């Protein structure tokens, strides 16, 4: 699936990018410490999974 | 060359190695934020 | 009289010089002066 590979790859990229910004702001704004524990936890699992998905697919296209 | 799968990513791969130096620039923007306290 | 925070103009200013300067280095490799 020449297309679904990159698709997941850009998802990693647009997500890393989201997280690069979000995690520092989230960490030092005192307001929503508890409203955000969720966000980064989900982002993180989502990030890791994305790396693995791209990992396995690479062995169908490279 | 990267493997052909990743050719749409070449121009971002070109800019990535300079990102370390921006961490140093970003430290100074930050002390300007806080005023060198 | 203080309506734009100094640190913003610095980063803006800063990045402004950084770009004119980078340009002069690109030109050292292109066109006039590049030995080519």
């Amino acid at each position: 699936m020449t297309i679904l590979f990159q698709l997941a790859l850009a998802a990693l990229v647009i997500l890393s990018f989201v997280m690069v910004i979000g995690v520092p702001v989230a960490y030092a704004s005192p307001q929503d410490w508890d409203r955000s524990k969720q966000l980064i936890f989900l982002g993180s699992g989502l990030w890791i999974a994305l790396v693995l998905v791209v990992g396995v697919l690479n062995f169908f296209v490279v | 060359k990267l493997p052909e799968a990743y050719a749409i990513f070449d121009p971002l791969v070109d800019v990535l190695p300079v990102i370390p130096v921006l961490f140093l620039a970003l430290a100074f923007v930050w002390q300007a934020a806080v005023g060198f306290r | 009289g203080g309506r734009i925070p100094l640190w913003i103009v610095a980063t803006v200013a800063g990045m402004g010089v950084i770009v004119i300067v980078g340009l002069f280095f690109y030109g050292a490799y292109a066109g006039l002066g590049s030995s080519l």
Binding site: I21, Q31 | P11, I19, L22, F23 | -
Partner: peptide
């Protein structure tokens, strides 16, 4: 082509000052 290169680093570069900018709005802990 090389404008590809310029837009990426323009974005990565703007990414830093943003965090600091966002964090002063929210009077976050700089």
């Amino acid at each position: 082509e090389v404008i590809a290169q310029l837009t990426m680093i323009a974005m990565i570069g703007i990414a830093g000052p943003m965090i600091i900018f966002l964090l002063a709005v929210r009077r976050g802990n700089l």
